[PDB]
Design a protein around this ligand. Structure first.
Ligand SMILES: CC(=O)N[C@@H]1[C@@H](O[C@@H]2O[C@H](CO)[C@H](O)[C@H](O[C@]3(C(=O)O)C[C@H](O)[C@@H](NC(C)=O)[C@H]([C@H](O)[C@H](O)CO)O3)[C@H]2O)[C@H](O)[C@@H](CO[C@]2(C(=O)O)C[C@H](O)[C@@H](NC(C)=O)[C@H]([C@H](O)[C@H](O)CO)O2)O[C@H]1O
Ligand SMILES: CC(=O)N[C@@H]1[C@@H](O[C@@H]2O[C@H](CO)[C@H](O)[C@H](O[C@]3(C(=O)O)C[C@H](O)[C@@H](NC(C)=O)[C@H]([C@H](O)[C@H](O)CO)O3)[C@H]2O)[C@H](O)[C@@H](CO[C@]2(C(=O)O)C[C@H](O)[C@@H](NC(C)=O)[C@H]([C@H](O)[C@H](O)CO)O2)O[C@H]1O
Ligand SMILES: CC(=O)N[C@@H]1[C@@H](O[C@@H]2O[C@H](CO)[C@H](O)[C@H](O[C@]3(C(=O)O)C[C@H](O)[C@@H](NC(C)=O)[C@H]([C@H](O)[C@H](O)CO)O3)[C@H]2O)[C@H](O)[C@@H](CO[C@]2(C(=O)O)C[C@H](O)[C@@H](NC(C)=O)[C@H]([C@H](O)[C@H](O)CO)O2)O[C@H]1O
Lengths: 357, 340, 367, 42
C-alpha cells in the first residue's frame, strides 16, 4: 500500500549527557553538544553564603580605584577575567598504522547570553534615580559592556596590550604578562607586545582587562566579540535561539579538536552596578550558552611514531649542554639546501630583493 | 476563454473565528489565526475603575524600592510578568495503518506591537521637562525597554537567573524560583542555575525579572527578543503590516502542536512613566498581535499503541490506597500458572 | 592503502618570517603575511622608561591648547599622526620576449584592532566618576574616535584640509602643508587645497588632523575608515578573526606592488583619557593587525624596453652645452620629410601636414 | 623605485619587524592533522 510519507529528518540516535558520546557513532554521525558557562568576573563562587560572600557571585566584587598615577593596585576580584572550559570528546581513531585519521571537527554553533532580563530589577539598593530624596529607581546597569567568545580545537591564543604598564596586578592569583613573562611590563605592552602573548591554559584567570584574542597568523579557534565603551552606556542584547553560526573555515573546515578537545571560551560584561552608598560600581556579567555541532573528519596523520620511538633515541644519550646552534647566538653562520639541478647561474646569491641593489 | 481570467490566489473557505476551524479542512488547508496578548505587567484587568485601580491597567503599579542589601521586597505589582495564552486547535486525521499522524504545524507569523503612538501624550502628570517652574512637558516614557516573544507548539521552557539572590519575592501570587525549586535561591541562580528552570503554564505570573527563554537542549518554540537597558533610554518601535516571520525549523518544520495547542508568549516593556510627584516610577507595556499561519503536517507516530493505550488507561485511572499486594507483606499468598 | 582520502586543502610550503618569501614560489603560489602596525600618535616609543616618557606610550602626550583665536600652537605630541609601513617583497619573473612581467598582487586582507579590552581598566587616576567625594571609576576612554586604513602597491596619496589655516604647526618634526609646501597655509587648505597634497613618504609624521586619504582620481591603495565626532561619545570595536576583505579592484585586480613593496597605513583613535589631575585630556589609540593575501600576477609591461634600455644608454653621452635647436628660439627654420614620390606638384612652395590622423595637401596658402 | 619616494615607515624587516608571520602555499595537500607539529626539542 501507498502511505503518506513524512518529511525525512535526521534520525536521532540517542540523546542524553556526555556519556552518550561513548556510543559508537559511525562516521557521518553528528553530535550536538550543548553547554554553557557561568560568567566569571571577580567574585568567585565558593563562598556560597550571601553574607560572607555577600553573594556577589557574578559581579566584580568591589571596584578598587587606584591611588595615583604611580600607584595602581587593582585587586583580584576587581577583575573581570576570561571564562572558558574544555569539552573532552572521545577518541575516534586507531589507524596510526595507516596515515588517514579521523577527528572531531566543530562546525556551527549557536550561542546566546541570558539573563538579560535580570537587568530589569530596579528596586534593591543602587544609587537611585533621584539622589536628593533618595528616590526613584535603584539605578540599573549601565557603562562599558563587552562580550566575546570562541569555539576552537586547542585553547585560545591571547595577546597582551594594556592601559598602564605601571599597573600592579598581584602576581599572586592571576595571570599577567609578568606571571607569564617574568619580567615586568614595558611600554610595548602598552601596545602591541609580540612577546606578551599567552594561552588560555587556565580560566577565570586571564583578566580580560589584559588578555586578548591575538590573531596569531595561525588559528584553529573562531572568536568574536565587541567593546562598547562609555560611562553611562545602555546595555543591549539578543535574547534568541533562531540562527546559528559557522565555525567553518575558509576551505570548509572549522575547528578540529586536537587532543580531543573542544574549547569554549567567552566573556560577557554588561556594565556595572553602582552602589547606593559611595560610587562603587562593580560590573555584572551573564552566562553564555553554546550549541556546538561537530562531525567526524578525515585528515592526514599528525603523529610521527618516530617521535615516540625517537624520544627513546635521545635516551641513548644524555642532555647536552654546549654552545648555541639555535637562538640569537646560533653559531650556525649558515645553511643551504639543494635538491635539484639547474644549469649554472651567474651570481647565484642574487639579491632577490630590489632595494639591495 | 473570451473573458480574461485574472490571477489565481488562495481560495478562502471561511472567515470567522475559532469555530471556523471545525469545517473540514482537507490536508493542505491552511489556517490563519490572528490574535493578540494584552501586556500583563503590574496591574491586572479586574479593578474595573480608573478610580480604585486608578486604571493603571497596563502599567507597573509603582516601583516599590528597598531597605538596602539585607532587604528588598518587590511587591507583586512592581513586577512585569511574562504574558501568554494557548490556541486550541482541533484534532486531525490518522492512518495507524502507516502509524502516521497529522499534526498542526506553525509556519510563519506576523506579529506586531501596537500602541507605539500612545507614547505621544506629553501632558498628564509625569515630571515635566522643566521641573523648576513646573513647566514644559509631562515627561514621556523612557528607560529600559524589553520585547521578546515566542511561538511554540508546547509551553515555553525557561531558565531563571536573577540579579540579587536575596530579593524577598512574595512567595505567594507569583512564581519564583522558590515557588518552583522548593527551596531558597542561591548564588548559582544569580548566574545560571540549571535547576532553576521551569515552564509557562501559568501567565501574568512569571515575572520577567526572573525567567528567560532557556535554550533547552531541545525546543518546539521560536523565541526572540532584545533588551535595551538604561535609565533614560528612548523607546523605539516597529509599525508594520508588511512583513512576516518564519517559525520554520532547521529542516522546515517549525513547531507542531503537541496537544492540539498552539502557544503564544511575549512581553513588551516600553520603559516607564515617572510621576510628577516623587520618583514614583512604574513601567508601561504594550500589547502584541499575532497572525500565525499553520498547516496540516504528517508525522510518524513515534510511539507504540499498546503502551500509549496503557498510559492512557493509567492516566485516566486514579492512583490508589491499597493493602500491600506486593512488597514485603503481600497479602497475596500465591500464584500458579497452568498451561494445558 | 585506500584508507579514505581526506579533504584537499591548499598545501603550505613553509611558513615563518619574510625570508620564507625568498624561496622560489612558483606561480600560483600564495603568500600570507600577518603583520601589524603599532598606533603612533604623540608620545613615541623611545623613552622606554615609564618615568621619563612616563610611558604615555601610544598616547597623545597632554593637550596643548591655544592662546586664543590668534595663536594656536599645538604640541608635537598633541598630534596623532598617521601610522604606517612598507613590506619588502621578492622580485618575480620576466619574459622580455612577451614584454610581460609578473608582480606582487594583493588581494584580500583581514585586519583587526586590538586591545579594546584594555579600555576596561577603570581604576588608576583619571577623573573619577563622582568628582565630589572623588569616587567612582577612573573614567574610561571616551570622546571622538577615528579609524582608517589602507593597503597598497605604493604609498598613500593624501590631501590635507585643516580646520584653521592659521595653526602654528611646527616646521619641525611633522609634515604639514607648509612642510610640504613652503608657502604657509591659506583658507583654501582650510577646505580643499588641490595643491596641498602629499604622499606617505614618511611615517608617524603627517598628523591625521591635517592629512587625509585623498581620492586621487587614480589609486592603487584601498582605504577606508570613519570619523565619529563628539566629546563623551563611547568607543566601539570589533573582535574578529572571521572576516576577510577584498583589496580587489573592479576589474578583478586589487593592488600590485610596483616596487616589490606592500604598503600598510592606518589610524586608530579610541578617544581621550582624562587625568583626574585636571582636564589634561590626552587621547589613546590601539594597534592594528594585517593579513595580506597576495598572488603572482602577470601584467603587460607598461613602458617599452627599448625606451628604457636606450633612454638610459643616451643619458650617458657627454652633456651638451650648446646653441638651441629646440626651445623657443630654435635656430632651425625648417624641416621636411618625404618617403614617397608623387609626380611634380604645381605650387612647389606647397606646404603639407598630417594632423590628429590625416595627411593633407596643406590649404592653398591663400585661405 | 625612482618615481616612488623614499620612506620612513615602521619596521617590516629588521630585528623588530612587526611582521608576525608568513606562509606560502603552492599545493593541495589533504587536510593535515596538526599542521604545526614538528622537530620537538625544549
Ligand atoms: C573583605 C573586606 O572588607 N576587605 C577589606 C577591603 O575592603 C574591600 O575591598 C575590596 C577589594 O579588596 C572591595 O573593594 C570591597 O568593596 C565591597 C566588596 O566587598 O565587594 C563592595 C560591596 O558593594 C560592599 N557591600 C556593601 C553592602 O557596602 C562591600 C562591603 O563593604 C564589604 O563586603 C564589608 O563591609 O565592599 C571593599 O569593601 C580593603 O580594601 C582591604 C585593603 O586592601 C589592601 C590592598 O591594597 O590589597 C590590603 C593590604 O594588606 C593593605 N595594606 C596594609 C599595610 O594595611 C592595603 C592598604 O591598606 C591600602 O593600600 C591603603 O588603605 O589595602 O582591607 C580589607 O579589610
Ligand atoms: C494603595 C497603597 O498605597 N497601598 C500601600 C502601599 O503603597 C503602594 O505600594 C505599591 C506597591 O506595593 C506601589 O508602590 C504604590 O505606588 C503607587 C500605586 O498605588 O501604584 C504609584 C501610583 O502612581 C501612585 N499614584 C499617584 C497619583 O502617585 C499610587 C498612589 O499613591 C495610590 O494610588 C494612592 O495611595 O501609588 C504605593 O503607593 C505600600 O507599599 C504598602 C506597604 O507594603 C508592605 C510591604 O510588603 O512591605 C505590604 C505588607 O502587606 C505590609 N505587611 C503587613 C503585615 O501589613 C507591610 C507593612 O505594613 C509595612 O512594612 C509597615 O507598615 O508593608 O502598604 C499599602 O497599604
Ligand atoms: C614635559 C613638560 O611638562 N613640558 C612643559 C609643557 O607642559 C606639558 O606639555 C606637554 C606637551 O608639550 C603635555 O601636554 C604635558 O601634559 C602632560 C604630559 O604628558 O607631559 C599630561 C600628563 O597628564 C601629566 N602627567 C601628570 C602625572 O600630571 C604630564 C606631566 O605634567 C609631565 O609629564 C611631568 O610630570 O603633563 C604638559 O604638562 C608645556 O606645554 C611646554 C610648552 O612647550 C612649548 C610649545 O608651545 O610647544 C615649547 C616651545 O619651544 C616654547 N617656546 C620657546 C621659545 O621655547 C613654548 C612657549 O614657552 C609657550 O608658548 C609659552 O608658555 O612652549 O613647556 C614645558 O615646560
Amino acid at each position: 500500500k501507498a502511505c503518506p510519507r513524512p518529511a525525512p529528518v535526521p534520525k536521532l540516535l540517542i540523546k542524553g549527557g556526555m556519556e552518550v558520546l561513548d556510543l559508537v557513532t559511525g562516521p557521518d554521525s553528528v553530535t550536538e553538544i550543548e553547554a554553557f558557562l557561568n560568567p566569571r568576573m571577580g567574585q568567585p563562587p565558593t563562598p556560597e553564603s550571601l553574607t560572607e560572600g555577600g553573594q556577589y557571585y557574578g559581579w566584580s566584587r568591589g571596584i578598587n580605584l587606584a591611588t595615583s598615577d604611580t600607584e595602581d593596585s587593582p585587586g583580584n576580584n576587581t577583575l573581570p577575567t576570561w571564562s572558558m572550559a574544555k569539552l573532552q570528546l572521545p577518541m575516534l581513531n586507531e589507524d596510526l598504522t595507516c596515515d588517514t585519521l579521523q577527528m572531531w571537527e566543530a562546525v556551527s554553533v549557536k550561542t546566546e547570553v541570558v539573563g538579560s532580563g535580570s537587568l530589569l530589577d530596579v528596586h534593591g539598593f543602587n544609587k537611585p534615580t533621584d539622589t536628593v530624596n533618595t528616590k526613584g529607581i535603584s539605578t540599573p546597569v549601565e557603562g562599558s559592556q563587552y562580550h566575546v567568545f570562541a569555539v576552537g580545537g586547542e585553547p585560545l591564543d591571547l595577546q597582551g596590550l594594556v592601559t598602564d604598564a605601571r599597573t600592579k596586578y598581584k602576581e599572586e592569583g592571576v595571570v599577567t604578562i609578568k606571571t607569564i613573562t617574568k619580567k615586568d611590563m614595558v611600554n610595548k605592552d602598552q601596545v602591541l607586545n609580540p612577546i606578551s602573548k599567552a594561552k588560555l591554559d587556565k580560566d577565570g584567570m586571564y583578566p580580560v582587562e589584559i588578555w586578548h584574542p591575538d590573531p596569531a597568523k595561525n588559528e584553529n579557534t573562531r572568536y568574536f566579540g565587541n567593546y562598547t565603551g562609555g560611562t553611562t552606556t545602555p546595555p543591549v542584547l539578543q535574547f534568541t535561539n533562531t540562527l546559528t553560526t559557522v565555525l567553518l573555515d575558509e576551505n570548509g573546515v572549522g575547528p578540529l579538536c586536537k587532543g580531543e578537545g573542544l574549547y569554549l571560551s567567552c566573556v560577557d560584561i554588561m556594565g556595572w552596578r553602582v552602589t547606593r552608598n559611595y560610587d562603587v560600581h562593580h560590573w555584572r556579567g551573564l552566562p553564555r550558552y553554546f550549541k556546538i555541532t561537530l562531525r567526524k573528519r578525515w585528515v592526514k596523520n599528525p603523529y610521527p611514531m618516530a617521535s615516540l620511538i625517537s624520544s627513546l633515541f635521545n635516551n641513548m644519550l644524555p642532555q647536552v649542554q654546549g654552545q648555541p646552534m639555535e637562538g640569537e647566538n646560533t653559531q650556525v653562520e649558515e645553511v643551504r639546501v639543494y635538491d635539484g639541478t639547474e644549469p649554472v647561474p651567474g651570481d647565484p646569491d642574487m639579491t632577490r630583493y630590489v632595494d639591495r641593489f
